[PDB]
Design an enzyme around this catalytic site. Structure first.
Site, PDB file in Angstrom:
ATOM      1  N   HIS A  41       4.333  -2.443   4.215  1.00 24.95           N
ATOM      2  CA  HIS A  41       3.214  -2.098   4.872  1.00 24.95           C
ATOM      3  C   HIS A  41       2.847  -3.121   5.568  1.00 24.95           C
ATOM      4  CE1 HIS A  41       1.229  -3.648   0.942  1.00 24.95           C
ATOM      5  NE2 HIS A  41       0.532  -4.408   1.874  1.00 24.95           N
ATOM      6  N   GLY A 143      -5.317  -9.907   1.535  1.00 24.33           N
ATOM      7  CA  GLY A 143      -4.309 -11.200   2.008  1.00 24.33           C
ATOM      8  C   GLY A 143      -3.338 -11.635   1.137  1.00 24.33           C
ATOM      9  N   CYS A 145      -0.854  -9.665  -0.620  1.00 22.87           N
ATOM     10  CA  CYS A 145       0.147  -9.153  -0.783  1.00 22.87           C
ATOM     11  C   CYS A 145       1.626  -9.919  -0.313  1.00 22.87           C
ATOM     12  CB  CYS A 145       0.239  -7.896   0.097  1.00 22.87           C
ATOM     13  SG  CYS A 145      -1.141  -6.571  -0.520  1.00 22.87           S
TER      14      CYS A 145
HETATM   15 ZN   LIG Z   1      -1.470  -5.498   1.719  1.00 21.74          ZN
END
Ligand SMILES: [Zn+2]
Ligand SMILES: [Zn+2]
EC number: 3.4.19.12
Lengths: 306, 306
Positions: A41, A143, A145
């Site tokens: 993503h 932030g 991820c």
């Molecule tokens: Zn993310």
């Protein structure tokens, strides 16, 4: 003596973290050999996350749309591919700090350390367990991820988790490093409910053994039980059922302390039914379930890494 | 979201740990520039520790009696001196992995991360606080002496603790990196009792703010109080008194949440007097006191290091 929730030393993992930017989206990546792994993503806008078609979105990206920075230095992306829910970015430089590593998919109840990162920079390290409903209870802000979870065996890092999502209830979901989610979750901003978060019984028992080893003994009682009798009580309190495999895994702690596993089960049964009456165990007023039997043996014997 | 007991990433400190051997005693040392710091009781036998005269024992040691190993490689000792309760071993090689660093002496209530080591090898990392009786509640087994505690500010490591002793009650004592003990403790195997371990009130309040930020709100009540009224209750429950300096330090958390500090004090007062009635806050059934106000701001905003 003493007993602490302890994470693995994070240095070997710190050297692998990078920042990945696609368009206006920045998150963390993991740089091992000449590949950077990150959540797919990264290619989404906030609007895209409501209903993304990742294959169609990815057609619109080329190697040069993926910006990878290691410290202050840019890496050149020479290929990209999607595997399940992760992107693999091939770069032209092998990470010189790559440790010995493997990719493992863990089971619920297993514990691991998380290196929380923002913009490719490490923020902190903590220990958690994979819950039986395949969520983790972490500390992740926007932030984060692409931050990873890992275990270390001497000099080999086993990567087991990459962070992808916060559910609307505030618990966390992610994938192994092959990109497959733990649990039924998907990388879409939609209503996703978690199932029952049961207590990991074998971990509780291990922690009770640790308590005895360290001198907290008040909960030991005069009773014993059977597996079937104990499991009837466990089910009532939303504890995982105990199997003979679990009994076998606790064998070394039983031998060290001289307390039979089923006797410890009977102590746990009385704590469930009567409560703690305002007392503590190893500084906790709850029954702790994010230490595995191997965590306890390790910490109680002083195993090291390098 | 979520809130975890989090340690600093340990990589910068891992690169500084070495093994120091004197005679038959091995423990950990800290290698910064061309100096290795370790506890002076490396020169003692088990018998010596009952009543050591360190100056007299040290006369019998020369540079070549101190064996320093960094990984698999031996370092050459070219001088040695005793400063308070630490030994400084000058080596002929500066540590190439030396980070930016300083030596700080912290105050009770301050938190820091411990890198537990054995034989110069990192085992694990955890977070703890300096208790108000100048002990820490750690996880240290034989061989862990010389393990250090630290904080990181961006790229600078502030070393604040070196581990020296376990008291007969199972709590831990040590020194700053100038070799001065925290508290009244001495590096001798004698009966040393710790004073009252009071709860660090300002840290509890910070953690209640963190709980509100993360959605745990059930304990907020309709009351307020005064500093003097609150402190009368705090003293009864062995809580540290709250000062206006503490109120000032909590200001940013008060402004963010809109909950006045004295209103939060009144919520804490009712939790002390009535208890938790079987509920939890941020997954705890106790009031947690090893997060400082700066720890909470940091974790709730995502500050990073490199
Ligand atoms: Zn993310
Ligand atoms: Zn020692």
């Amino acid at each position: 003596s003493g007993f602490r929730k302890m994470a693995f030393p994070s240095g070997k993992v710190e050297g692998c973290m990078v920042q990945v930017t696609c368009g206006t989206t920045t998150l963390n990546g993991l740089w091992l050999d000449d590949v950077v792994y990150c959540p797919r993503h990264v290619i989404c806008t906030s609007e895209d996350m409501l209903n993304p078609n990742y294959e169609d979105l990815l057609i619109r990206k080329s190697n040069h749309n993926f910006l990878v920075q290691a410290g202050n230095v840019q890496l050149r992306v020479i290929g990209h591919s999607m595997q399940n829910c992760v992107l693999k970015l091939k770069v032209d430089t092998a990470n010189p700090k790559t440790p010995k590593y493997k990719f493992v998919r863990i089971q619920p109840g297993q514990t691991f350390s998380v290196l929380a990162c923002y913009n490719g920079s490490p923020s902190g390290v903590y220990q958690c367990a994979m819950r039986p409903n395949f969520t983790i209870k972490g500390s992740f802000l926007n932030g984060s991820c692409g931050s990873v979870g890992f275990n270390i065996d001497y000099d080999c890092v086993s990567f087991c988790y990459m962070h992808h999502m916060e559910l609307p209830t505030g618990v966390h979901a992610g994938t192994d490093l092959e990109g497959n989610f733990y649990g039924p979750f998907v990388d879409r901003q939609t209503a996703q409910a978690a199932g029952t978060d049961t207590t990991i019984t074998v971990n509780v028992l291990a922690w009770l053994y640790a308590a005895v080893i360290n001198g907290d003994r008040w909960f030991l009682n005069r009773f014993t039980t059977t597996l079937n009798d104990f499991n009837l009580v466990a089910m009532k309190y939303n504890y995982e059922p105990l199997t003979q495999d679990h009994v076998d895994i606790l064998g070394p702690l039983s031998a060290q302390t001289g307390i039979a596993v089923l006797d410890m089960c009977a102590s746990l049964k009385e704590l469930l039914q009567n409560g703690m009456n305002g007392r503590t165990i190893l500084g906790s007023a709850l029954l702790e379930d994010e230490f595995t039997p191997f965590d306890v043996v390790r910490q109680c014997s002083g195993v090291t890494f390098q």
